[PDB]
Write a protein that binds this ligand. Structure first.
Ligand code: NI
Ligand code: NI
Ligand code: NI
Ligand code: NI
Lengths: 83, 83, 81, 83
């Protein structure tokens, strides 16, 4: 794209999954200003929910989505695209 | 239904609308949802983004979503059913 | 002139006429100084906010005195880092 | 009377540090405090800031704080006591 957008990626994962947290955070740190913040909810022993606020064009954003959303031990990864 | 469910309500609204932040907060205090928390981004002079994280039976989540969505100044008020 | 990050922790009563407008107006007119806010609705008359702030120690302290002095704020403490 | 209370724990840490993100998350899931939520700012390549919002008695909170305070790679870990 070029068109500048805001989005939320809602994630459910198990933090017991070996190296998952390391991957998700390295992806977000390596993505520059694309990631505004994350809010985390410790649901139970094997479920975390995260809302990851994202900003950029539609293509940068879906790509971030697919990176985080494909990792092993991610149960659920859904984009809400806003503007 | 009769159980525990997690949802994320994603809202974009105009904080220039008279009383709007105050009404959105009160709807949340008054609700028999347990709102776990709300994260807010001041996107610009006319746009705020909130991710409101909710727990409850579907009826109450849905009542929250409609009630927020029915406020003048809300531009976008979309729910992600997670859980 | 050194850029720093800070958390302003606020408790206030949302039933206070116009406190919410004033707080959000301050933050919106503060440019890139506010990163985000996280809100917990404690009970009928208490909200806790965690307001995350970025700038020099002066710009930050001002921001603090601005939110911090509004009528209806019970508590306004700054963590510097 | 019985004394469940609110606190904010503010943490700066190095996400490069070997499995620090997993361990902090793990400490949070395993504690007897109610962690309401964690907000995370990716500050730069070596710095993450978290705001951990907590509810419980002063003992379990102080336990959480000292425990996060003692992981290698955590750089700053101040509690703010609320009510
Ligand atoms: Ni968790
Ligand atoms: Ni705003
Ligand atoms: Ni509130
Ligand atoms: Ni980070």
């Amino acid at each position: 794209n070029d068109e500048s957008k805001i989005a939320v990626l809602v994630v459910i994962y198990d933090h017991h999954q070996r190296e998952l947290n390391q991957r998700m955070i390295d992806i977000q740190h390596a993505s520059g200003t694309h990631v505004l913040c994350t809010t985390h909810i410790h649901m139970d022993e094997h479920n975390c929910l995260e809302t990851i606020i994202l900003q950029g064009n539609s293509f940068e954003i879906q790509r971030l989505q697919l990176e985080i959303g494909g990792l092993r031990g991610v149960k659920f990864a859904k984009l809400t695209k806003a503007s």
